Every structure is written in C-alpha cells, then in structure tokens.
Design a protein around this ligand. Structure first.
Ligand SMILES: [Ca+2]
Lengths: 347, 363
C-alpha cells in the first residue's frame, strides 16, 4: 500500500475546534473517492468519527476511531493498510487529530535518564544535545509548535520538570492534525508518479506495570515492533527515522531499540552528529515531538506525513539528502505499545 | 474469515471492574495463539494519560507482547471491531485475532431545522414510533409486542440483563419514557463483555470442527444530525450497510437476525432496512409471529438489546457470539431451527453508522 497525498497543519495553541482542525487538514484530500475514514484520536464530544464524516460532507462514508493513546496514529495507519489489502476499502483517509487546549511519563523519563547515565557513563550533555538538535530542526519546520533554536546551556538551564530533566527536553501539550490518503500499490501511480510505499509495519505491546518492566534503558515493545517491521519490509537500512521522543532520553533509547546503535552507544551518535540533519542517519528531521509538539492522536500520522515529504524530496530546508527509505515509531505510554512503519520509494 | 471460539459474561449492573469483566470473558480463550487484540469499548478513557485501556488489557491478561488497539464507533463499536479483525486476518497482518467488546457503564444527537437542539436517543425513537404509526397505520400494540417477544427470548438467555417474561398489558402500562414509548420498550444501561476468536478460513478447521464463517460485512455512515428532511422511519446507514453485506455475502436468504433494538420501534424499522420486509410492513411481521423464535425468520432470538441490555462496546461482539452459538446448534432453549445463515447489525447513535455482518456454516 502507498501514501499518495497528505495534509498537515501547524501544531500549537490553536484557535480552531477539533472539527475545524480536521476540515483544514483534509480540505484538499476530499477530491478523491474516499471510501473509509479512520480517525486517530485519544481524548474526544462523542461519536467523533461520524461527526467528522458529516462535517466533511462525506455523510455516508464509513468511519471509526482508533485509540492507542500516544501510539494511536501508527495503529490507525496499520488498520488503514489492512482495510486496503483485504479489499474492504480502496481509498482510505486516515486523520490524526487532538485538541488539548480546551508513575507519570515525565517521572519515568527521568528514571531512564539517571539509569542510562549510570549504566553507560553517558555525559548529561549528550541527552540535552538531543533537544539542541531537535529545536534546530523544528526551527526549519513551519508546522512545528516550537520554532526556536536553543543552546545546550539554555536547555540545561530551562526549568526542572523531573530531576535531572528540564522543560526544553520534553514535548509540549499541543493541538493539531495530520492526514494521509492510502491506496493499494496497483492504484498508486494513478494518484502520483512518486507514491511513498509502506514497506512493512510491526506492532508490539509490553507490560504496562511499571513495577514489572525489566529495566528503564530499553523499551522491549519498540525492539519487538522494529524487528517485525524490518522482517516484513525486507530491508536492513534506513535513511532517516521519526521517533517518539516524549523526552530527549527516549530518542536515544529508541534509536538503539530500533536497531541503529548498540545499547548504550546511542548517546555517542548524538555527540558525533550522526543523527543531525546533515549526518549519516538523521533522526527527527521534523524537530521530533521535542519541537513539533505532541497532539496525542495526530503525532503518529504526522510522522507518516514527514516520511512522505522526505522521500519525495519535498521537505525544503529540513530535507534529508537522498532519502529513499524511512522509519517512524508511534508509542503508547512508557513503551506499553509500539508501532514501527518503514516507508520507501519502492514497494 | 471465521469465528472459532467465543466468550460471554452475564450482562447487568456488575460490581466487577472492566478488567475483571475482560478476564472473565477471555479466561477460556487465552490458550489460543492470539497475535492481535482488538478492544471494542467507547467510554473507558480514564487511563488515557497514563497507561491506555487496550495496553492495560493485554498486561492484565498476561499477553504482554501481543499488540492491541481500541476501536470506538460508540454503539456501533463491536461491529467495527469485527471488521478491523477480519481485515487484519485477510491482509495477513495477523493470524489469530481476539476481539473483546466490553463496557462498564453503571458506575445524543443534534436536531436542526430550516437554532439547535440536543436530543436523547430515546426521544428520537418516540418521534419514529409516532411517524411510523401515522404513515403506515400500524397499531400501537404491534410496537409493544416487540418487547413481549424479546423479553420471552431473553428469559431463555442466562446471560441477559433482563430474564423476565412480560405481557403486552405490562409493557403498555410501564412508565412513559418519551410519549408514546414506555420503559419496557427500551434497552437498559448495562455492564458486560463478549469476545470472539477469529482466524482465516484456511486455518478455521484447525481450531474447531464447526467454524462460523463471516460471509460478508457491509459498512456505512449517515448524516450525524437530524433535520426535518429525514423521514424518521428509515435508517439510511442500515440500508446501505445491508446492501453492501448481502452483495459481498452472495446469499439472498437468512435464517435469523440480531438487530440493534435500542427501542422496540427500531427493531421494526431495521427489519425493513436490512431487506426482510417492505417499508411499513415490519409491524405486520411482528403481529403475524414471523419474527418469533419459532417463526419463519426469528429476529433477536438472544432477547435483543431490549432484554440482553446494552453495554455500548460489548453489544456488537455479543451479537457475533449469538450467531456463532445459533449456527453451531448450541443455543439451547433459544435455538433457531436449522439455523445456517445469520445476520447482525451493530449501529452507532440514531443511525450515524452501521455495520452489518452475515454469518454462515460455509465460507
Ligand atoms: Ca497493496
């Protein structure tokens, strides 16, 4: 299956209600013969999915809502892919949207940062450097909630959230929406001469009991989901990755868990610049959750919009040079569920 | 794809929390090599900032690595969840899907005119009953008789919220909810869970000697607000979903139907919209007994929503459990004679979305 067109809007403190966010992101996608709408949304208003199809003048088109909290967008893409491949649908619109304006995760993130620094002798600044890189990338992203470059000192001086992690290292609460149109491979070239194919998806959960999680430097759901995705995609190399960096430390851990770097060496890739926009393997060229902001149900879909734009050479100043294959990770809770999607310019 | 095993709880006002309802319904199903869990649930969003319901479920059930997600289409959630499971199987994304429908409820639509009003589903049903009686000259008793039939069926269902026979007189003397419809004609607020295990057809006989195949599914939305341009006697989403299901299923005949009878009048209207009876004739089938348990076309042999109760996210899955039991000749006193092909209808709101599933003893 392939993504053939997309919609995105600016994330942040938005004037629009949930329905108008959806109308904005899908305005240009209703020209196609959409035959299922999958809504990725966690917090909604009742019957959001039917309210949406009526609001869009798609009154008869069937819809449903997929919720996997912060992993909703990836799960929704999986459902869309399966609807297409099973031939239940031919042209699926996936819209992720959240309106947020109208043992906690931050706490677990600081526990991981402490344990990672302890086990691997990683300097504190390697974790903060992730926010420097991501704020730089986000400053190039006209849709990002935060578009402000920061130095290491500014990150490390920003207000404490959960010792040692500071404000600039966490994703903000955000409103926003993102959308993709997906079709089977046999249909893809009728829509565009450059479709972005889904090569493989992997999905996994892991124990949600904080007390039962084996440690805090690995996310076994991300490991498993990645393993499944790469197996199905039949590749072993990617050109960029959009990760689920609710805190900076998570980008590091996830970069290891998807298979890019050995466990405890992800921080070295950060300091080396391997993961910067002009590095061998850019991570979060969008700015990541760090700078994009994180409208819960939208994020997993926004990552697919990023992969589509990057592979098509349409990402402008944020362009990953010669990007042909990419990866996204959508994650619920502290690794409670993970979906990894691999995209490419070939099926 | 086929349903190869099921689970069901008693519906009612339950003291158990949602986790223990899910543990109960799946306790005999965890032995299978489940590789995706789909949770059908509409109102349990309390964990949305911490752990998340579908992930809390796989953890509670010790299915730690198995992926899961929640499908919400309000009262139509169970049918939508079954469609998602079918597609995951047919696309080969999954090989054995567990669908759990669950709701723990115990503890609306906009109306425009060519000003806004918010209306409850029970108030909409009464508007339909008045218009249906006016347009088709249907006697009031025909609408009440649906609740007699369903309470009789429900009294034979050990899982039903309500297991008490009522007379026509008792129905017509029960408290007015929204004139003219009365308490005994509406579904109660219920807690409960239901579950199915589904696999591809090529795998079905590996799991059971008597698989119950999904012959086709049809899905449609319809306008999510009510205007004075609606006829109040047809549910166009049900019409469209049923058309699609029968087209795909390639049958023209069913042996029984499980419908979404939030109010008695809806059973009548839906029996027409699925194609059994002409518009305005459904009431005649009730009075003739065609739709009773021994009739030519039993509707709601389970007791329907009227007597089962209606745990929002569980209902659409419970209807699949009913179809499975009926087609396997396992429904006991509620058994539909020589049942081989069946239908269920899972409906959101006042017809905002509908999923129609056709089941059979053959692929
Ligand atoms: Ca395809």
């Amino acid at each position: 299956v392939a993504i053939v067109d997309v919609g995105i809007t600016k994330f942040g403190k938005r004037k629009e209600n949930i329905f108008d966010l959806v109308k904005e992101v899908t305005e240009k996608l209703l020209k196609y013969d959409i035959d299922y709408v999958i809504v990725s949304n966690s917090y909604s208003t009742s019957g959001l999915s039917s309210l949406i199809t009526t609001y869009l003048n798609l009154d008869y088109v069937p819809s449903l809502r997929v919720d996997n909290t912060s992993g909703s967008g990836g799960s929704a893409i999986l459902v869309a892919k399966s609807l297409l491949e099973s031939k239940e649908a031919n042209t699926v619109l996936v819209v992720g949207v959240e309106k947020m304006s109208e043992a906690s995760l931050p706490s677990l993130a600081s526990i991981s940062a402490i344990e990672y620094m302890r086990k691997f002798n990683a300097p504190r600044e390697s974790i903060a450097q992730v926010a420097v890189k991501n704020h730089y990338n986000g400053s190039l992203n006209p849709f990002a909630h935060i578009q402000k470059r920061v130095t290491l000192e500014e990150v490390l001086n920003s207000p404490v959230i959960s010792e040692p992690l500071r404000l600039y290292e966490y994703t903000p609460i955000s409103d926003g929406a993102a959308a993709v149109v997906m079709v089977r491979n046999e249909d893809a070239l009728s829509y565009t001469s450059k479709p972005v194919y889904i090569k493989g998806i992997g999905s996994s959960n892991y124990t949600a009991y904080v007390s039962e999680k084996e440690d805090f430097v690995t996310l076994p759901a991300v490991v498993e989901a990645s393993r499944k995705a790469f197996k199905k995609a039949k590749v072993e190399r990617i050109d960029f990755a959009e990760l689920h960096d609710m805190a900076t430390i998570l980008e590091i851990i996830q970069s290891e868990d998807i298979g890019l770097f050995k466990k405890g060496e992800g921080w070295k890739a950060v300091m080396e610049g391997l993961t910067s926009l002009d590095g061998e393997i850019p991570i979060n060229p969008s700015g990541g959750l760090n700078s994009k902001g994180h409208p819960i149900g939208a994020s997993g879909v926004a990552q697919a919009v990023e992969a589509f734009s990057q592979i098509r050479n349409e990402a402008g100043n944020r362009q990953v040079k010669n990007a042909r294959v990419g990866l996204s990770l959508s994650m619920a809770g502290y690794g409670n569920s993970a979906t990894v999607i691999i995209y490419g310019d070939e099926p």
